[PDB]
Amino acid sequence: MSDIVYMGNKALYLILIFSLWPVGIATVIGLSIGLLQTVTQLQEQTLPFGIKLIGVSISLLLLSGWYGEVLLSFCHEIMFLIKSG
Amino acid sequence: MSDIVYMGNKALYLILIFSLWPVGIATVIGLSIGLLLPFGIKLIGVSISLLLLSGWYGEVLLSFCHEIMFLIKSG
């Protein structure tokens, strides 16, 4: 059904999957640090940013191989579609 | 092409470690002054840290650039 629309939905699906884990880790870290700051009354915004940077960097470092594999599979599927467009 | 992913990992680790020292000292100063104008003290601290680690940053970055040049020498 409408191969173009199918490919667009596939691209959005891949976008959501790729952006799920780092975004989730970032928001969880931000909320946790904010709650800690509220509890202990420190009023500092550098700590959440630093820990978010560390977590996002670690996650992106870890997920690189799977990211590349999925993207290469998607590109090969696109080329296969081009072969008989 | 494992060298490409290795270089990506090197870049990510280099970014993390370079951002570790100044952001970390700024966070330490912020928490220490919040436990009891924070921006002025934070800026003084980060400026001192950058002044102290400027040579180390430069030499590490130049070493990385030389490594990249060596890789592209015959790649």
Binding site: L61, L62 | S2, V5, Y6, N9
Partner: peptide
């Protein structure tokens, strides 16, 4: 080459294999 390492380079995996 610990098996419980966090990030392992491709050389590490090839050596472990």
């Amino acid at each position: 080459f610990p098996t419980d390492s966090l990030v392992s380079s491709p050389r590490a995996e090839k050596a472990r294999l």
